[PDB]
């Protein structure tokens, strides 16, 4: 495919925000929903356009085993591809979380993981409107604006299509797509 998708997930919401969006794009114009758990580093490095998702977990962490998830996810995957430089790339961030029981934690992995590919002289897209959320503070809002999108399927399940469509409709021009 053209488009890679990786995603971290522990309770599989994160995998289901995934396959929703790999769900009207082709096998040649996005590859199918993978997680990181099992990504080589040389597989990842292969796409020249990436869509990422994460939830956010234990003390505002990235999912992984400090954070007590059930296996490896982010956290670890992150180090073998921490070498890779992304410049002359292009990547899209989506985070998973709960503003209602972090309210000052609302997506922090989301901003370690911008962080991490920002820093690679990543091209990042995707910027969202913190209008409609509830929370104090967050480490994925730079400039009063969510680095990626944002989704609460805690609290908010009932907006996540209208913000899917919204964000890939956001996106599109930048990934090539004719949408
Ligand atoms: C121990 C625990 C800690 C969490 N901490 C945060 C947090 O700091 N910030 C946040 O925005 N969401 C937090 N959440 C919410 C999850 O990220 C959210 O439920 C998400 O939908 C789970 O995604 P997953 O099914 O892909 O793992 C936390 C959830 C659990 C169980």
Avoid: C, H
């Avoid at 790999?22 to 040389?42: C, G, I, P, Q, W």
């Avoid at 990547?91 to 934690?105: H, I, K, R, S, T």
């Avoid at 990042?124 to 944002?150: C, N, P, Q, R």
Wanted: proline share 3%; aromatic share 12%.
């Amino acid at each position: 495919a053209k488009i890679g998708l990786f995603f971290g997930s522990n309770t599989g919401k994160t995998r289901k925000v995934a396959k929703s969006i790999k769900k009207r794009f082709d096998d040649e114009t996005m590859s199918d929903a993978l997680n990181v758990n099992r990504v080589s580093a040389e597989d990842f490095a292969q796409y020249q356009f990436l869509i990422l998702g994460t939830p956010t977990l234990g003390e505002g962490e990235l999912p992984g085993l400090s954070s007590d998830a059930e296996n490896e996810s982010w956290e670890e995957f992150l180090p073998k591809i921490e070498g890779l430089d992304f410049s002359g790339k292009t990547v899209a961030l989506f985070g998973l979380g709960d503003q209602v029981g972090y309210p000052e934690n609302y997506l922090d992995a989301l901003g370690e993981l911008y962080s991490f590919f920002k820093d690679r002289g990543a091209k990042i897209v995707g910027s969202w409107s913190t209008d409609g959320y509830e929370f104090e503070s967050s480490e994925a809002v730079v400039d009063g604006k969510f680095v990626g999108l944002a989704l609460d399927l805690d609290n908010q399940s009932g907006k996540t299509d209208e913000r899917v469509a919204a964000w890939l409709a956001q996106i599109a021009p930048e990934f090539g797509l004719s949408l």
